[PDB]
XYZ file of C-alpha atoms in Angstrom:
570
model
C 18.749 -33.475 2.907
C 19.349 -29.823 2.736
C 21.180 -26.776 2.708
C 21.440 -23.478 4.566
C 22.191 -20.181 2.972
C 22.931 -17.188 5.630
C 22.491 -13.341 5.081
C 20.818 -13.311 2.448
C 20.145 -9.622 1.703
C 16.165 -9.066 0.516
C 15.478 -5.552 -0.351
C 12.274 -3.542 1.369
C 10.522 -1.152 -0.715
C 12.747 1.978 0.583
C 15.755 0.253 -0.369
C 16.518 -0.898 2.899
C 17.846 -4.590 2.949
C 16.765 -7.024 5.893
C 18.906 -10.027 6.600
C 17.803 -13.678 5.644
C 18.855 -17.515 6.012
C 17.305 -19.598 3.806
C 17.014 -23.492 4.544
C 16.256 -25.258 1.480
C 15.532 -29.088 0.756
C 18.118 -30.883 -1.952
C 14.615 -31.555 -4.575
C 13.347 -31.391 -7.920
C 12.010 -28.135 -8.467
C 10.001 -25.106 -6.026
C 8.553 -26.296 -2.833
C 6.092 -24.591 -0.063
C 7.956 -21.780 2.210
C 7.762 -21.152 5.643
C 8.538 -17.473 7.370
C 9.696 -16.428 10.577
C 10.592 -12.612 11.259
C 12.643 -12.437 14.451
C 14.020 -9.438 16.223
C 16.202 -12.167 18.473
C 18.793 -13.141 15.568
C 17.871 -15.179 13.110
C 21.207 -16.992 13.602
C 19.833 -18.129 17.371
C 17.475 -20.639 16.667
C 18.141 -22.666 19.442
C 16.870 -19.312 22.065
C 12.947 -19.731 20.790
C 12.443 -22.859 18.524
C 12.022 -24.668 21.893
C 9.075 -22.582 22.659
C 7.327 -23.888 19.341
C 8.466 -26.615 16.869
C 11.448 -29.101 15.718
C 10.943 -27.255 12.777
C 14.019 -28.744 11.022
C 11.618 -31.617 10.463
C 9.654 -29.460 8.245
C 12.919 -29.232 6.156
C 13.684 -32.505 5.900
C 9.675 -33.047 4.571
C 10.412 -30.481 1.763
C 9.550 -27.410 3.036
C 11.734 -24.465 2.903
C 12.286 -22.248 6.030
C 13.474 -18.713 5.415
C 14.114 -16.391 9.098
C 14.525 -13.125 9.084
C 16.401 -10.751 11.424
C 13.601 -8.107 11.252
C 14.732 -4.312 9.845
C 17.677 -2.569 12.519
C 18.851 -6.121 14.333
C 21.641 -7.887 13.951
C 22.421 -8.676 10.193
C 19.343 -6.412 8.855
C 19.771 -2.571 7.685
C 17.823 0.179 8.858
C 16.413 1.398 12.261
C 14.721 -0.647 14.922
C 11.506 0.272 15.739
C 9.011 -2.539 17.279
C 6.037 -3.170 15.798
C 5.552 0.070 13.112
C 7.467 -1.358 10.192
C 6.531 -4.829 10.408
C 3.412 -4.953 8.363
C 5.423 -3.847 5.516
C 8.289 -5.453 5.533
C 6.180 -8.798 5.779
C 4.821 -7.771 2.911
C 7.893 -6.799 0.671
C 9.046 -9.873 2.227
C 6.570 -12.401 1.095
C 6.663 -10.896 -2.152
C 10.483 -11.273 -2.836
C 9.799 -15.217 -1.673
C 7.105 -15.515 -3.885
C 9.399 -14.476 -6.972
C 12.187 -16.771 -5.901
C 12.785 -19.671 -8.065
C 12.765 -22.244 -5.049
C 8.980 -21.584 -4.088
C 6.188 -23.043 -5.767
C 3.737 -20.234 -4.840
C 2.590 -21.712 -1.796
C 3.702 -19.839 2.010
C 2.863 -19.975 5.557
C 4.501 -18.681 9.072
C 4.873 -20.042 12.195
C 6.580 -18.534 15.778
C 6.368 -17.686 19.072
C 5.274 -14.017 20.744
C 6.855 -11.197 18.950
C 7.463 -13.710 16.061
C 3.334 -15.089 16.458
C 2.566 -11.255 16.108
C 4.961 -10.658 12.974
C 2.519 -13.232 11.815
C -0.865 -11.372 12.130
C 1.254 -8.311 10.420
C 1.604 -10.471 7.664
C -1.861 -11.379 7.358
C -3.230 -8.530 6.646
C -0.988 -7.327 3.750
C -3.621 -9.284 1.007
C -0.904 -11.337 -0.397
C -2.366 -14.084 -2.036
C 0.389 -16.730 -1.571
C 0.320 -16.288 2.620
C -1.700 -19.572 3.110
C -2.061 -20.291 6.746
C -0.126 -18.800 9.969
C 0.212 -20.527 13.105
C 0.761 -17.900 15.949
C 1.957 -18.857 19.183
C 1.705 -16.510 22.388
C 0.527 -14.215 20.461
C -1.914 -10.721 20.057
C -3.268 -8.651 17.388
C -3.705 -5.312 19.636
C -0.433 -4.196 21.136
C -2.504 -2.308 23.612
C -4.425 -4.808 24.981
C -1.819 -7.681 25.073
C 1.245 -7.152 26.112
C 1.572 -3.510 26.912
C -1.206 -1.894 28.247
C -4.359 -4.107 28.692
C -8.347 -4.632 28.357
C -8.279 -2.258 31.805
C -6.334 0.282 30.667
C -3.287 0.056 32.673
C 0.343 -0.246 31.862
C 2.271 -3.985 31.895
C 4.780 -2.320 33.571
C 7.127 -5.237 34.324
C 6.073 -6.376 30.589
C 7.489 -2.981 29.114
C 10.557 -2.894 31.529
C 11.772 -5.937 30.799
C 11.331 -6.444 27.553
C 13.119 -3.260 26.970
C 15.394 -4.351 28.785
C 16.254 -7.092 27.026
C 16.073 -5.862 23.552
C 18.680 -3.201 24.597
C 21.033 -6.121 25.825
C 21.053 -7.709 22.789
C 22.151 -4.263 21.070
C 24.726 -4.064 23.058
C 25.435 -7.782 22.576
C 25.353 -7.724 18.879
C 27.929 -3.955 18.791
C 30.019 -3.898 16.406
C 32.928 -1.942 17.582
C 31.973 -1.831 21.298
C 31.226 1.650 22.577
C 33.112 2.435 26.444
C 29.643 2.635 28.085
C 28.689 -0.619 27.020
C 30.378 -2.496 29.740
C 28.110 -0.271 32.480
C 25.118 -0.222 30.304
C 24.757 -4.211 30.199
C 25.341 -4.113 34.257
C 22.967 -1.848 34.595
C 20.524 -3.816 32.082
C 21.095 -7.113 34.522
C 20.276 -4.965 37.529
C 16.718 -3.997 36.076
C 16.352 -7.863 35.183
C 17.731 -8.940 38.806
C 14.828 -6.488 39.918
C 12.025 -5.162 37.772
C 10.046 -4.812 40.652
C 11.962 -2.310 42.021
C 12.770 -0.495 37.877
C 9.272 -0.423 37.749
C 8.943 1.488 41.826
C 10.644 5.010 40.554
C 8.600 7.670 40.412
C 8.121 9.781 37.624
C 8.205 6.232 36.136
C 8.696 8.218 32.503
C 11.848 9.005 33.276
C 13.905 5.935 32.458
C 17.736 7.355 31.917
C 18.806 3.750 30.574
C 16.089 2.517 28.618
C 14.775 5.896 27.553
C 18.264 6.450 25.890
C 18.599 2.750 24.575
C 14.998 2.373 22.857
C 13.343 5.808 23.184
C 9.678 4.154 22.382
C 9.594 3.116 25.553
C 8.595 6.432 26.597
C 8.136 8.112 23.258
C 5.248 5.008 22.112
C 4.555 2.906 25.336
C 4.405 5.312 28.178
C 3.576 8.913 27.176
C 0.377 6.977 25.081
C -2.042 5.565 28.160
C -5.251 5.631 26.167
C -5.709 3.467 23.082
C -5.367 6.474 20.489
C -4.358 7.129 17.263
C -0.729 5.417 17.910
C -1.811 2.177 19.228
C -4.674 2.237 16.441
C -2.042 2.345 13.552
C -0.627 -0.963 14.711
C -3.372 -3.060 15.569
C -4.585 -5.742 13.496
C -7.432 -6.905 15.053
C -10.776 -5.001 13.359
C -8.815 -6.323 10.088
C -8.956 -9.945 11.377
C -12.654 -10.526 10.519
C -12.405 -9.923 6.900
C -9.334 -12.374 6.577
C -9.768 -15.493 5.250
C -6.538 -17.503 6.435
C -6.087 -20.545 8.311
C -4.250 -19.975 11.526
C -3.015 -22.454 13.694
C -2.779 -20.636 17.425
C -1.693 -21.428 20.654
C -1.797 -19.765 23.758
C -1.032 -20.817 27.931
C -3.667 -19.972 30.705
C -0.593 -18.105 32.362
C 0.885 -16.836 29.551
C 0.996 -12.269 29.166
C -0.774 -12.711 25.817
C -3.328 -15.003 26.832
C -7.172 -13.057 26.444
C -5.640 -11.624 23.156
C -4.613 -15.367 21.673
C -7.754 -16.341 22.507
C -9.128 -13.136 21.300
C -7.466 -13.850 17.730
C -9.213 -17.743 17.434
C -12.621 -16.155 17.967
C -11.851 -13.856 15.021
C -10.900 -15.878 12.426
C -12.829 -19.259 13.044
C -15.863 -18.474 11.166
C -13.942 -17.360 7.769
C -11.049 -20.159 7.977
C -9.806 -23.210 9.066
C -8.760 -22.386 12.625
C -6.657 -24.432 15.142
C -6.538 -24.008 19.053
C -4.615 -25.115 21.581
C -3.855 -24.088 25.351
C -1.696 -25.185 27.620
C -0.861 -24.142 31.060
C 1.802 -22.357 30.318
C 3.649 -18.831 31.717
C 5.589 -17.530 29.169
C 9.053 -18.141 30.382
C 8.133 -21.561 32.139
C 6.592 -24.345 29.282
C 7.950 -27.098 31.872
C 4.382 -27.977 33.482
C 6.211 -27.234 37.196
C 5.930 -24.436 39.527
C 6.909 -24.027 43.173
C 3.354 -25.238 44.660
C 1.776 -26.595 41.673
C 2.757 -29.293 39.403
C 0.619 -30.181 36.494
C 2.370 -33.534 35.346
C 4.736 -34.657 33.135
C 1.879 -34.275 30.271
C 1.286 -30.626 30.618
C 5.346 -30.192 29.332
C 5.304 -28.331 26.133
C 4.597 -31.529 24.000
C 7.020 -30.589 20.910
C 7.243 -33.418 19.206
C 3.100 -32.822 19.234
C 3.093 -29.978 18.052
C 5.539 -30.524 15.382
C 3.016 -33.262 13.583
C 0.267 -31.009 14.350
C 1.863 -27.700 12.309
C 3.170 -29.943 9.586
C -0.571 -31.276 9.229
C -1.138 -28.247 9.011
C 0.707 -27.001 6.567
C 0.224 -30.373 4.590
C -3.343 -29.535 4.143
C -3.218 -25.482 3.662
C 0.167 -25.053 1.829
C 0.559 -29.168 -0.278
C -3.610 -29.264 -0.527
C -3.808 -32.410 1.056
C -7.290 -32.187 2.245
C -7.582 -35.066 4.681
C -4.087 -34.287 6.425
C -5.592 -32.771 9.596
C -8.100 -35.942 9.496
C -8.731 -36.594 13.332
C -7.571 -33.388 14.986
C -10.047 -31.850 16.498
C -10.719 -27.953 16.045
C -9.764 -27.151 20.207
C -7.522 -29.191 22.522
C -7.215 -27.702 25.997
C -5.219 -28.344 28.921
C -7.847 -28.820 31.539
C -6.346 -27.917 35.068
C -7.537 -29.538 38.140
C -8.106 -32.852 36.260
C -5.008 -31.725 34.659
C -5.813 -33.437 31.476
C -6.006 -32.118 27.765
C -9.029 -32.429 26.491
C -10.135 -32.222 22.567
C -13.138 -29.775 22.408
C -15.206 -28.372 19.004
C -15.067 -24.961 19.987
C -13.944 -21.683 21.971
C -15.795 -20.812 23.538
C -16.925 -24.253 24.706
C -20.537 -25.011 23.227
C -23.159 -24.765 26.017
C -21.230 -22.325 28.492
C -23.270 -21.562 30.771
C -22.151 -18.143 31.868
C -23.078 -17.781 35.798
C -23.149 -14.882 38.135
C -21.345 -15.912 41.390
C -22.316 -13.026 43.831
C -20.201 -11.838 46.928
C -21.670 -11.900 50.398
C -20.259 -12.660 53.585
C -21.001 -11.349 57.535
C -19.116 -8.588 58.683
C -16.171 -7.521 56.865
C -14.642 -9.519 54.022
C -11.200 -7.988 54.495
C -8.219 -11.132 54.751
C -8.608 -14.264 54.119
C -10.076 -14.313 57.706
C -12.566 -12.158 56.832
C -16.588 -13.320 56.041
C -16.581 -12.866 52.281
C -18.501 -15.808 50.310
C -19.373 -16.253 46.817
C -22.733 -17.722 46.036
C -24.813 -18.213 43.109
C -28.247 -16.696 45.116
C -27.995 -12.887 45.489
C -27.003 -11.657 49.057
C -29.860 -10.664 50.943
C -28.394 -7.544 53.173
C -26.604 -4.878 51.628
C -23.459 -4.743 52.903
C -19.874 -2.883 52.171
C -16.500 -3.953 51.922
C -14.022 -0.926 52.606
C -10.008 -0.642 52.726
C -6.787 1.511 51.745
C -5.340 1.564 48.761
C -2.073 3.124 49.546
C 0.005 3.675 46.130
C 3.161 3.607 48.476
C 2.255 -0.074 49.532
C 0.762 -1.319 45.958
C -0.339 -5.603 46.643
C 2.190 -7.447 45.351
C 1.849 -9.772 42.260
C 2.165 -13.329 42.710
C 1.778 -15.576 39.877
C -0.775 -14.882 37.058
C 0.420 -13.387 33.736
C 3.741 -12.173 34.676
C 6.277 -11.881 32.152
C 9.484 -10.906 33.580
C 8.507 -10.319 36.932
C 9.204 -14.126 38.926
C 7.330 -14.964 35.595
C 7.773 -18.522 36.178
C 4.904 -18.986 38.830
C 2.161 -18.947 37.280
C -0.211 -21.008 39.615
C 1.311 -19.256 42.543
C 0.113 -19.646 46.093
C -1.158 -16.789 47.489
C -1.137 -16.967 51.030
C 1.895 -14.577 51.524
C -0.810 -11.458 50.751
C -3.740 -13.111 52.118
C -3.139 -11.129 55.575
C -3.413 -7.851 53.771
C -6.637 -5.371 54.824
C -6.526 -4.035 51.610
C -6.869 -7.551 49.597
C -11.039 -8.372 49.897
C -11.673 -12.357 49.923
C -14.448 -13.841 48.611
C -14.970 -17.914 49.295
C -17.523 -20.866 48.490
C -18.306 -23.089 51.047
C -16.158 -26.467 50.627
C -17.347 -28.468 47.522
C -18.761 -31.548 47.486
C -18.779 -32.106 44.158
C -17.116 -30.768 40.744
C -17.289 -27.254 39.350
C -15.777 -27.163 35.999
C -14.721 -23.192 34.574
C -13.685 -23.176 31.362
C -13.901 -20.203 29.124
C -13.674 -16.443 29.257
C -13.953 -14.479 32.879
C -14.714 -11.306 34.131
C -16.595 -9.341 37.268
C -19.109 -7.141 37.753
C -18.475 -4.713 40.890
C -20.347 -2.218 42.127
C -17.557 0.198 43.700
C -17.131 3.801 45.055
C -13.834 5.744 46.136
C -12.968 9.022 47.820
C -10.435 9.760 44.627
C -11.508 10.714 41.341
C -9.684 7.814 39.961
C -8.053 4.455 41.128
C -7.753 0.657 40.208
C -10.187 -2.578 41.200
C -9.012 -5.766 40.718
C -10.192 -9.219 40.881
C -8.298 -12.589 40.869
C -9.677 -16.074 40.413
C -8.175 -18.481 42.803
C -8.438 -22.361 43.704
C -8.448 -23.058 47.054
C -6.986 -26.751 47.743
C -7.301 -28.545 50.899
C -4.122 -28.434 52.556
C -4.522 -24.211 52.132
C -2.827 -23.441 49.110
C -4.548 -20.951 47.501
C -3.626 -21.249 43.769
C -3.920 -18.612 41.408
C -6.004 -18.767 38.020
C -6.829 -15.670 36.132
C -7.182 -11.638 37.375
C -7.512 -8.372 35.623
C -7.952 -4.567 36.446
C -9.860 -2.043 35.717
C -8.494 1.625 35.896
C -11.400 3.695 36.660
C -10.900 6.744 34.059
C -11.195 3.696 31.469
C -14.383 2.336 32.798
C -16.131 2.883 30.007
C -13.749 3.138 27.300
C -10.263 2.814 26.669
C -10.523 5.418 24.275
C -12.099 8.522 26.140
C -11.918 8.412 29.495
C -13.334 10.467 32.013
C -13.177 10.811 35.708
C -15.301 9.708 38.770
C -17.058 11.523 41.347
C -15.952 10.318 44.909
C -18.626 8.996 46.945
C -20.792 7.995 43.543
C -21.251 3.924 43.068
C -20.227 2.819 39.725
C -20.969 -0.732 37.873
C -17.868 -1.344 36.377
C -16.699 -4.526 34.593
C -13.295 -6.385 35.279
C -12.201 -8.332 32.037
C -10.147 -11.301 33.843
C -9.185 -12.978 30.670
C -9.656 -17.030 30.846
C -9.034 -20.248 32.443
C -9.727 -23.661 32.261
C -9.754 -25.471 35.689
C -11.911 -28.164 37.160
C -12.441 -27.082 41.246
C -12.505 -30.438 42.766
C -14.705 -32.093 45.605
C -12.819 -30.689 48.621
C -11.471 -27.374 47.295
C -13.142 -23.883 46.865
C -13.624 -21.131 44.452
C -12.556 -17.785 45.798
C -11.885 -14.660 44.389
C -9.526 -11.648 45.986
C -10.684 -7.987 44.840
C -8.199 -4.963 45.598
C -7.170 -1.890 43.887
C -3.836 -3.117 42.729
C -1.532 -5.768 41.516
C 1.988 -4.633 41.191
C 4.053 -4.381 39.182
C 1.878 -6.285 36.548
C -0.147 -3.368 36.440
C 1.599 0.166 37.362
C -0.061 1.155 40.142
C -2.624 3.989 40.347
C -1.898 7.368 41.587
C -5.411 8.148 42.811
C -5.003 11.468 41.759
C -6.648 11.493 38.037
C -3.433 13.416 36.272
C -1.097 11.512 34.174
C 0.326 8.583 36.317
C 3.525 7.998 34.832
C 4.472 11.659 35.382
C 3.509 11.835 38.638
C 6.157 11.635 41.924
C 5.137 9.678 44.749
C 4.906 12.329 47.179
C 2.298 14.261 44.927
C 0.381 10.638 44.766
C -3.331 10.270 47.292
C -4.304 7.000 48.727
C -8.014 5.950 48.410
C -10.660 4.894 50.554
C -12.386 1.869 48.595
C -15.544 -0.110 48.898
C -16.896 -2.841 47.107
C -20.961 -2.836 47.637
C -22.744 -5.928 47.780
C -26.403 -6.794 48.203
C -29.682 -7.217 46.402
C -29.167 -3.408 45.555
C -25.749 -3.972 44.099
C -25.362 -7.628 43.209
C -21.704 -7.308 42.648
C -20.429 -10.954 41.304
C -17.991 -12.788 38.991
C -19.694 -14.649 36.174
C -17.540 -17.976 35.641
C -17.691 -19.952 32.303
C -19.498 -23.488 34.068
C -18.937 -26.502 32.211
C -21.533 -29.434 33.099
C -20.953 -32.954 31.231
């Protein structure tokens, strides 16, 4: 049995007051507390606790659960900014817990995306009584997960829609309606019917709507394309190797925050008790179903799962029962293509065997048509891939990490861009027996361009039998940012660079009868905003004033241009 307290008012250290409920179990005397900070109303816990835990269970076990509308949302005081005040109101907020009469010293978090990153926020405010965290979907560099990215171009569908919806829920929660509410909220709908087309104006800064709803979106997200001094203030992650707390994270192959979840676990396992577990996931689609791929009933978000596995968990981190996570193993991954979860020691899996998969191909490797292979011998004849990039006519994204975008496809089929000139395939010969890739991905391309800057991309695919052509993991890299995401600096046209492509992770089994391809392009949009070829600031720039590129991919025993894939032999 319990009870349920709501708006309680705990006060920040500048006086401001954020909003709490506090569920509390009918007992003896203090218990262990768990913390969720949530910018979607605390009083909506049906909206996310489906994405993560029948956390009421923890109630009825004698925990307490306190959430928290976070500082300017709904019942809280003060101004809504994401992400720059949430350090320290974790902290202020843990604190006032820890003095309450109903906790025994003892507190942990657990929550999904924006309430998994609230979590590392917390972490690294040194209070003592934060025992474990278990972040789900989550990232400890804003930059690199979900806004900008390891290649150093904007989420743009990420930024737009989220915005988006944040600003319908201020709307939504007005007190006192305002006249231009009504038109505001249409107009909010019509970016979410179509972000796609939000994200296609040109200068994309200006944003009349969003701009004037949330003015970070331009102010924080867009006008800041480097990772500088802003984006530095709020990451966590060079302060997650001197932590020393247990975190319990999951993440989904198709999931936006994906190569930073994964990033987090490889952080913190050495100095804690660390928990991992992926499933196949996009962020708005847990079902295990997708228009040409189905990955069984099993592959559903298993709830009820994860609800034992947290309050192990917890048990053993928050109540000191050392044997309660007896028999879970460290890693459990949903292996596609078997489409199976599998319990593993590590992540990275132990004895990876990182392996350069070179592109080849007679004549011109253009369409799906085209000659491109992918080998693990280096080609013999030097050969060169070349196409348009167009910033008028960006490739379309299918599938992948999409948030709001059709971000419910993860494993999509690519044939509808496989006819494209400007979309480079690269295939293995049919297999007759099993290549297993599990673990982190990336490419190493030797490219040139007439421009002084543009995009490459690269894209992991499965190839099944009856042609679909099923999407795994991609990234970009944005040419200025070759180097650095820091510092960049344009390229001469003509010159060949080596540049990596950071393509985040997958686990997927290719079976006998399928093959491992890769497409390589110079955009993917609008997952990525496209590139204006013109090295000046992109998100200021109209289209008219944009160049397309000539592109080339090099490929020989000169320029062994490849994708090394995590193989997995048991």
């Amino acid at each position: 049995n319990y009870s349920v307290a709501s708006n309680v008012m705990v006060p920040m250290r500048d006086g401001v007051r954020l909003a709490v409920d506090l569920y509390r179990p009918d007992a003896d005397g203090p218990v262990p507390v768990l913390l969720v900070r949530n910018p979607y109303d605390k009083f909506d816990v049906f909206a996310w606790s489906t994405q993560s835990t029948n956390w009421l269970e923890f109630v009825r076990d004698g925990y307490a659960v306190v959430i928290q509308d976070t500082r300017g949302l709904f019942a809280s005081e003060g101004e809504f900014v994401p992400h720059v005040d949430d350090e320290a109101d974790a902290e202020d907020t843990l604190s006032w817990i820890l003095e309450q009469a109903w906790c025994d010293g003892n507190v942990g978090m657990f929550g999904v995306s924006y309430l998994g990153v609230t979590q590392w926020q917390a972490a690294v405010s040194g209070v003592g009584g934060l025992k474990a965290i278990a972040p789900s979907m989550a990232s400890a560099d804003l930059y690199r997960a979900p806004w900008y990215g390891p290649g150093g171009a904007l989420s743009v569908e990420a930024l737009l829609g989220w915005s988006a919806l944040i600003g319908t829920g201020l709307i939504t929660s007005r007190s006192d309606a305002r006249p231009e509410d009504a038109a505001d909220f249409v107009q909010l709908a019509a970016i979410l019917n179509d972000v796609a087309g939000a994200a296609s104006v040109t200068p994309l800064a200006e944003q009349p709507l969003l701009g004037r709803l949330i003015p970070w979106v331009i102010d924080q997200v867009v006008d800041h394309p480097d990772n500088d001094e802003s984006w530095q203030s709020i990451s966590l992650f060079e302060r997650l190797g001197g932590l020393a707390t247990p975190a319990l994270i999951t993440a989904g192959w198709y999931d936006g925050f994906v190569g930073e979840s994964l990033r987090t676990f490889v952080a913190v396992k050495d100095n804690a008790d660390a928990r991992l577990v992926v499933g196949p996931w996009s962020h708005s689609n847990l079902t295990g179903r997708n228009a040409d791929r189905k990955f069984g009933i099993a592959a559903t978000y298993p709830i009820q799962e994860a609800t034992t596995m947290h309050k192990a968990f917890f048990d053993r981190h928050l109540r000191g029962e050392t044997d309660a996570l007896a028999g879970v193993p460290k890693v459990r991954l949903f292996v596609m293509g078997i489409d199976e979860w599998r319990d593993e020691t590590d992540w990275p899996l132990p004895d990876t065997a990182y392996t350069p998969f070179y592109l080849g191909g007679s004549g011109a490797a253009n369409t799906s048509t085209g000659g491109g292979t992918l080998s693990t011998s280096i080609s013999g004849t030097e050969s060169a891939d070349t196409y348009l990039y167009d910033p008028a006519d960006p490739v379309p994204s299918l599938g992948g990490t999409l948030l709001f975008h059709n971000g419910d496809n993860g494993p999509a089929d690519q044939r509808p861009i496989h006819d494209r000139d400007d979309v480079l395939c690269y295939s293995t010969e049919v297999l007759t027996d099993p290549v297993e890739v599990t673990g982190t991905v990336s490419a190493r391309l030797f490219v040139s361009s007439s421009a002084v800057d543009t995009d490459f991309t690269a894209k992991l695919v499965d190839v099944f039998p009856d042609g679909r052509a099923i999407a795994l993991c991609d990234g970009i890299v944005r040419m200025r940012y070759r180097e650095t995401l820091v510092n960049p600096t344009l390229i001469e046209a003509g010159e060949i660079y080596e540049v990596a492509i950071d393509m985040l992770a997958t686990s997927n089994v290719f079976l006998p009868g399928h093959r491992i391809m890769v497409q390589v392009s110079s955009s993917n949009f609008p997952k990525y905003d496209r590139n204006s070829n013109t090295g000046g600031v992109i998100a200021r720039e109209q289209l008219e004033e944009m160049c397309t590129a000539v592109n080339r991919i090099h490929r020989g025993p000169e320029h062994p241009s490849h994708i090394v894939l995590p193989i997995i032999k048991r």
